[PDB]
Amino acid sequence: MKILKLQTLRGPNYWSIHRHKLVVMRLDLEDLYEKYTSDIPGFYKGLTEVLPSLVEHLCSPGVKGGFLTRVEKGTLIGHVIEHVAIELQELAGMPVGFGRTRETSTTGVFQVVIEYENEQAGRYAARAAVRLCQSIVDTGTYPATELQQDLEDLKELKNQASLGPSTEAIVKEAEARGIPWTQLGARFMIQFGYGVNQKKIQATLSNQTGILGVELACDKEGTKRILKDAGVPVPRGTVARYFDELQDAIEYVGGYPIVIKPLDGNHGRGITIDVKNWQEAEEAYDLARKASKTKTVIVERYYTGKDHRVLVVNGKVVAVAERVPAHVVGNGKSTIAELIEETNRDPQRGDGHDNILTRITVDKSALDILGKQGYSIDSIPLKGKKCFLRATANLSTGGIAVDRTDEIHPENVWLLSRVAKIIGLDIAGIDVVTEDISQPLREVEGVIVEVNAAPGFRMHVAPSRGLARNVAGAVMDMLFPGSKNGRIPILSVTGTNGKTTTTRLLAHIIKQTGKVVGYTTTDGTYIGEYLAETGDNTGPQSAHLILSDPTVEVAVLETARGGILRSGLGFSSCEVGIVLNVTADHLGIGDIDTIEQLAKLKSVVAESVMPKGYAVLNAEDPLVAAMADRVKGQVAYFSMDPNNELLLRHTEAGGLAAIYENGYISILKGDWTLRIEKAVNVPITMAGKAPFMIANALAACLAVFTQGVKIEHIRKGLSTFVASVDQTPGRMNMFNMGSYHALVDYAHNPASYEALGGFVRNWPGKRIGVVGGPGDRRDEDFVSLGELAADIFDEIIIKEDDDTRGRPRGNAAELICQGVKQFLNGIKNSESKATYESILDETAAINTALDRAPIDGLVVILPESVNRAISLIEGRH
Amino acid sequence: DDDD
Numbered sequence: 001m002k003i004l005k006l007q008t009l010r011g012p013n014y015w016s017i018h019r020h021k022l023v024v025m026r027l028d029l030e031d032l033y034e035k036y037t038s039d040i041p042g043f044y045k046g047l048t049e050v051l052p053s054l055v056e057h058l059c060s061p062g063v064k065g066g067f068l069t070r071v072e073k074g075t076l077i078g079h080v081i082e083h084v085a086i087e088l089q090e091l092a093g094m095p096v097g098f099g100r101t102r103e104t105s106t107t108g109v110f111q112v113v114i115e116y117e118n119e120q121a122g123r124y125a126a127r128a129a130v131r132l133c134q135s136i137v138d139t140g141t142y143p144a145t146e147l148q149q150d151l152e153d154l155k156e157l158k159n160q161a162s163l164g165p166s167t168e169a170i171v172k173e174a175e176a177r178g179i180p181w182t183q184l185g186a187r188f189m190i191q192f193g194y195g196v197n198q199k200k201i202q203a204t205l206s207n208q209t210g211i212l213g214v215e216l217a218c219d220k221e222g223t224k225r226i227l228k229d230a231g232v233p234v235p236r237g238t239v240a241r242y243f244d245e246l247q248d249a250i251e252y253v254g255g256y257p258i259v260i261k262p263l264d265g266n267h268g269r270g271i272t273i274d275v276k277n278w279q280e281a282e283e284a285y286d287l288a289r290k291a292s293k294t295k296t297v298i299v300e301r302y303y304t305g306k307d308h309r310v311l312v313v314n315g316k317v318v319a320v321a322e323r324v325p326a327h328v329v330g331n332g333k334s335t336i337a338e339l340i341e342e343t344n345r346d347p348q349r350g351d352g353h354d355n356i357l358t359r360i361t362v363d364k365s366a367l368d369i370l371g372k373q374g375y376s377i378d379s380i381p382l383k384g385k386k387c388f389l390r391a392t393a394n395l396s397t398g399g400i401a402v403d404r405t406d407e408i409h410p411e412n413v414w415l416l417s418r419v420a421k422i423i424g425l426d427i428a429g430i431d432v433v434t435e436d437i438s439q440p441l442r443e444v445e446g447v448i449v450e451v452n453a454a455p456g457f458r459m460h461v462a463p464s465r466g467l468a469r470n471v472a473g474a475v476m477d478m479l480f481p482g483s484k485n486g487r488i489p490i491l492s493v494t495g496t497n498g499k500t501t502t503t504r505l506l507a508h509i510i511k512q513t514g515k516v517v518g519y520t521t522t523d524g525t526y527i528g529e530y531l532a533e534t535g536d537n538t539g540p541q542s543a544h545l546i547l548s549d550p551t552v553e554v555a556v557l558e559t560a561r562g563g564i565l566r567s568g569l570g571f572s573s574c575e576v577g578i579v580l581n582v583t584a585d586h587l588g589i590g591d592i593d594t595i596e597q598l599a600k601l602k603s604v605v606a607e608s609v610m611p612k613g614y615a616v617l618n619a620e621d622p623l624v625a626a627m628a629d630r631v632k633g634q635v636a637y638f639s640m641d642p643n644n645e646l647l648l649r650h651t652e653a654g655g656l657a658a659i660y661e662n663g664y665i666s667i668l669k670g671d672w673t674l675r676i677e678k679a680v681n682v683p684i685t686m687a688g689k690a691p692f693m694i695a696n697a698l699a700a701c702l703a704v705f706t707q708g709v710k711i712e713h714i715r716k717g718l719s720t721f722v723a724s725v726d727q728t729p730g731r732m733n734m735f736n737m738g739s740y741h742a743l744v745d746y747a748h749n750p751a752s753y754e755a756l757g758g759f760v761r762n763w764p765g766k767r768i769g770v771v772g773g774p775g776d777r778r779d780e781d782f783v784s785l786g787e788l789a790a791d792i793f794d795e796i797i798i799k800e801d802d803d804t805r806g807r808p809r810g811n812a813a814e815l816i817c818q819g820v821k822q823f824l825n826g827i828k829n830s831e832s833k834a835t836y837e838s839i840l841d842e843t844a845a846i847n848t849a850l851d852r853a854p855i856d857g858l859v860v861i862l863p864e865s866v867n868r869a870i871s872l873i874e875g876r877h
Numbered sequence: 878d879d880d881d
């Protein structure tokens with residue numbers, strides 16, 4: 001067993017839709033290619049002893065233990081490998097239930113698909129499954145120590161790439177509301193939405209939380225001063241840094257009792273709660289001074305009452321919880337010694353950062369605190385009344401929270417909302433000490449102890465003594481006020497031969513509307529009028545750049561099949577999905593070997609259309625039109641033939657189609673015909689000579705019309721879009737220099753070759769062509785290219801791309817020569833006797849093509865890179 | 878720190 005390739009998918013993909021997280025591996029079965037489990041000595045027993053949990057796999061039998069019966073009858077090792085990977089990552093607490101295995105075109109390689117919850121964990125499980133199965137086939141069993149090591153590694157991977165409970169809850173709420181979310185790679189920030197409608201959170205702070213408010217909240221004395229200036233009842237306190245100032249400060253606060261705390265503290269280090277005389281105040285001051293990082297200590301009046309935590313989101317009180325410190329009640333005539341561990345044996349209590357209820361830690365400090373209680377370990381509580389173990393009233397110690405949201409006085413709600421607004425925090429956690437939260441803070445001597453930025457609401461979503469509160473819902477309401485997601489219109493263009501031109505035309509048409517359009521094509525990624533990134537940029541790695549840009553209002557993404565195969569789609573859904581055509585030209589790449597497979601792959605864009613979206617399909621293409629079903633949302637057809645029966649039937653019942661009827665680009669809205677242009681005033685059609693460009697214009701116009709774009713905007717965009725070097729790099733770029741003309745193009749497959757010929761054959765001058773193709777294509781494609789070039793052209797110069805993609809140098813050139821020779825031999829008389837010659841250099845090929853161009857001739861160039869031809873024709877004027 |  002050798003792993004040849006390991007790919008991970010993060011969006012809708014070839015293998016499944018709504019199963020975005022998948023991993024696919026090319027597994028080589030060098031020796032066990034046709035070796036069933038029933039034929040392997042001791043395989044079944046060793047496998048079922050290593051992992052007894054496989055009995056829960058309801059396989060194709062559909063009954064408990066069906067996979068075990070499948071192994072009994074004899075099954076290929078790829079199936080058991082996928083099942084053991086699923087179970088291996090399932091044992092680590094990660095539920096996954098999708099798996100597929102298919103035979104590839106090559107003899108010995110399988111393709112195994114595993115659903116994952118964590119990318120690293122999924123890849124690790126996929127790598128470990130083959131090792132486990134190889135060990136089982138070699139020795140009959142797998143060591144238990146290696147199994148435990150692998151599960152511990154999987155658990156570590158799951159824990160490492162895990163969000164915290166606050167971020168997890170917020171993300172779950174966003175997913176429930178259908179708001180897209182992605183993880184930024186900088187500071188554990190989560191981005192909600194797309195483009196100009198995006199928001200960001202880290203854990204609880206949003207992108208709208210102010211620096212000034214957070215910094216003020218972090219400052220205890222500044223916050224107290226600000227709240228006191230606003231009339232908020234803060235505790236009466238004073239700062240002190242030297243021993244001598246203590247007596248004067250205690251005189252100022254108003255007597256006894258008092259509180260001694262440090263200015264800066266974490267987990268309440270060195271904070272005393274209640275002291276009533278001199279010496280204890282002295283030692284508390286010493287402890288706080290040695291606990292503070294700046295030697296300075298707060299001294300304030302002590303206020304009796306329970307400690308409440310109030311959560312304010314968007315200036316509204318969302319949850320109120322009373323923090324009762326760790327305690328035990330002897331209502332069952334039992335003392336502390338039994339209840340300390342009786343509570344610890346409750347399943348609710350747990351450690352870590354997931355379970356709020358922590359075990360009652362009987363620390364030496366806790367022993368001292370219960371010493372100050374006035375009772376002992378075996379001292380039975382009187383009457384069955386609460387007896388406490390600590391006074392910090394925190395969940396980390398082992399305390400409990402009581403929901404008080406329904407009992408807070410409205411005046412208190414108003415005061416706390418004012419406090420949150422005064423500090424300047426959209427989300428704030430306010431600590432209140434009061435005897436009764438149901439009465440105003442003025443009647444009782446309630447005080448505001450502190451204001452917390454980025455508070456943890458974990459205690460409010462699981463109070464354990466009241467009703468849970470939907471804090472994540474409140475946060476999402478703040479981030480997205482109405483019934484609005486963060487989505488921007490997404491237009492995904494897929495197809496075999498016209499993705500780039502259609503994408504650029506759509507971008508231009510939408511640019512006619514006053515909107516910033518971010519679009520990625522084969523040439524590069526553009527935002528507005530400026531280039532944002534160079535290169536290929538036809539995959540999700542470039543779609544993320546557009547979707548995360550804060551200025552993009554509409555996204556038009558050219559979705560090549562390569563990106564879908566490699567990692568799926570970069571988005572969950574699209575507003576418009578355009579499928580132009582599916583032609584079997586570059587077969588054999590990946591697992592795609594038949595045109596049905598290619599159609600299934602390209603149908604991902606059509607099937608990803610949201611229910612309120614539109615799918616623009618070519619009615620003239622039978623395979624594309626076959627995607628009419630299994631598509632959620634409306635369907636729109638475009639056809640170059642106005643008499644298409646399917647299109648007419650679709651328009652009769654409904655509408656939303658586009659045709660080219662009598663020299664017009666027209667939109668059919670049912671029984672109404674809306675003409676856009678004469679198709680001779682559209683520059684890219686070149687007076688209607690190029691029919692494929694007319695089809696691209698039809699698709700683009702239909703796509704923009706389905707979104708409500710005005711007819712005048714479509715008209716202006718179609719009229720002002722040019723097919724020259726200023727806008728189109730090499731898409732039907734015609735250059736005039738007087739003596740002849742040069743037509744540089746991007747044709748590399750038989751379908752685009754036929755489309756190019758359908759326009760070149762109309763030229764009345766000499767036809768010179770430099771043709772070629774990528775080296776990763778099949779030989780039959782090269783033969784077809786050669787014969788088509790023989791059919792359409794009069795002078796042939798064959799060139800092979802410098803980046804040959806692993807193919808031996810030259811081979812494609814002589815095979816295109818074989819194709820042109822076959823076409824030449826297929827002609828009886830001198831009907832078409834085009835001359836042929838082959839040179840393997842791009843510069844030499846274009847130089848020879850431009851050197852021998854006669855008067856009024858046409859020279860067609862199909863270079864590896866458009867910039868080479870552009871520069872070469874720019875230098876020669 | 879981190880969720881105060």
Ligand SMILES: Nc1ncnc2c1ncn2[C@@H]1O[C@H](COP(=O)(O)OP(=O)(O)OP(O)(O)=S)[C@@H](O)[C@H]1O
Pocket residue numbers: 235259261262264265266267268269271300301302303304307392393431433449450
């Ligand atoms: N002046 C006071 N009067 C009465 N109770 C107080 C007073 N100051 C603090 N407390 C209580 O002590 C708790 C801790 O006080 P804090 O001001 O939060 O000190 P700290 O150093 O910030 O500790 P943490 O990390 O914030 S829990 C509060 O939640 C109150 O229950």
Ligand SMILES: Nc1ncnc2c1ncn2[C@@H]1O[C@H](COP(=O)(O)OP(=O)(O)OP(O)(O)=S)[C@@H](O)[C@H]1O
Pocket residue numbers: 495496497498499500501502522560580581692693695696730731732745746747748751752755756
């Ligand atoms: N609808 C169409 N049908 C057939 N050929 C077309 C069509 N639209 C354009 N072409 C031709 O195909 C060539 C290459 O296609 P482009 O639209 O320029 O780019 P592309 O479709 O993205 O190709 P890839 O996938 O990026 S290699 C163009 O230069 C045209 O000559």
Ligand SMILES: *N[C@@H](CCCNC(N)=[NH2+])C(=O)O
Pocket residue numbers: 214218452453454455878879880881
């Ligand atoms: N509770 C928290 C507030 C700090 C704000 N968060 C960041 N990242 N600055 C604290 O540590 O006091």
Ligand SMILES: *N[C@@H](CCCNC(N)=[NH2+])C(=O)O
Pocket residue numbers: 163164165166167168188202203204456878879880881
């Ligand atoms: N409190 C906050 C912390 C998680 C974010 N920080 C890191 N390092 N993951 C939370 O989400 O609970």
Ligand SMILES: [Mg+2]
Pocket residue numbers: 450452881
């Ligand atoms: Mg604090």
Ligand SMILES: [Mg+2]
Pocket residue numbers: 499500521522523
């Ligand atoms: Mg392209």
